[PDB]
Amino acid sequence: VQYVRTHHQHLCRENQCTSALVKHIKAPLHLVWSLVRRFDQPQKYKPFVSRCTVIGDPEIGSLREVNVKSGLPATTSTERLELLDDEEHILGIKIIGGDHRLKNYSSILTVHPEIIEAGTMVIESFVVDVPQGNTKDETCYFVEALIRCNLKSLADVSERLASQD
Amino acid sequence: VQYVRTHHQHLCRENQCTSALVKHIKAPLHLVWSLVRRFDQPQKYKPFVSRCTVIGDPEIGSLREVNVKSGLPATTSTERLELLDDEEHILGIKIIGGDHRLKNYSSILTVHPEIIEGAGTMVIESFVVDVPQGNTKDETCYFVEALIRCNLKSLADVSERLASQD
Ligand SMILES: CC1=CC(=O)CC(C)(C)[C@@]1(O)/C=C/C(C)=C\C(=O)O
Ligand SMILES: CC1=CC(=O)CC(C)(C)[C@@]1(O)/C=C/C(C)=C\C(=O)O
């Protein structure tokens, strides 16, 4: 699309991979945005987050500590809010630490209005270091699986709330 | 495609999910098929297999025990050759055991000739698998799909590399 080139086509280092995922949601922008924007409450649509803690009211620079469910190669992740534009509908996160295999993970999510035939298009893209011993493809296929899980869930939650009002 | 309706559109139990993946490879069919069909040698293109054991010459009904690399929610898998048609280029596998979370995994893979830019081959692999208690259909299928993309991409890489050399 037009938007992929604007925010989502990333230049990454040799030891890195990058990808972008698109999701269409039969819900209005305001529902979808007010779910993704909530930095201290990803567990509301992210299926693998069991717990999330943020000290103070969230602002740019804030850290969150997220605990993930059993069955994953990770138990905790520490994440920083890099960008949050309520007017342009842009969210930037960088994972800065924790239990897991994702070093230098950086993320940008954008939300856009679309066609009922009101809908919403969510694009999330990332960059991440390839762990020693894995390939670019392996790393990016796995991370994409996580993101698909998130955006599909975000879709379901959003469309559920839309049907109620 | 029109092929996915023939071999790859599966009906599911409620507790199951199903999906199909396509890969185009810039290599001739003979190379791709030779790799895919070697039931006792999946580690030749499957990047997560560290070891494979098949007792006796592989026939229909044969079992393989695959050992898997560290870093996965699995160490071993035991798998059965359900179907191998060397003329139609069809392979069917069923995962019957191991210490992993894929109960009742069934797999079908077909290979088809294509015209590459100037030659090429299209690989379709689809599966059915139980949703583990506590996961959703989406989670289950998105994860298994990650594994299959890894395998088919590697298959593409190995195939095209071999095609370079003649
Ligand atoms: C579910 C999970 C699995 C891991 O192995 C790493 C980590 C714990 C960071 C993670 O929460 C990853 C989450 C990702 C990639 C995106 C997100 O949630 O926006
Ligand atoms: C790589 C891996 C990870 C697991 O969690 C289960 C298992 C060990 C079965 C597996 O080998 C799965 C392989 C799959 C789904 C298809 C294949 O390779 O044809």
Residue numbers in the entry:
A (entry chain B): 18 to 134, 137 to 184
B (entry chain A): 18 to 135, 137 to 184
According to the publication:
A 13-member family of ABA receptors PYR/PYL/RCAR (PYLs) in Arabidopsis thaliana was genetically and biochemically identified. Upon binding (+)-ABA, dimeric PYLs underwent a pronounced conformational rearrangement, and then bound and inhibited the group A protein phosphatases type 2Cs (PP2C), including ABI1, ABI2, HAB1 and PP2CA. PYLs/PP2C heterodimer blocked substrates binding to PP2Cs, and thus released downstream transcription factors SnRK2 kinases formerly inhibited by PP2C. Structural analysis along with biochemical data in vitro demonstrated that steric hindrance and hydrophobic interaction in the pocket of PYLs were crucial for their stereospecificity to ABA enantiomers.
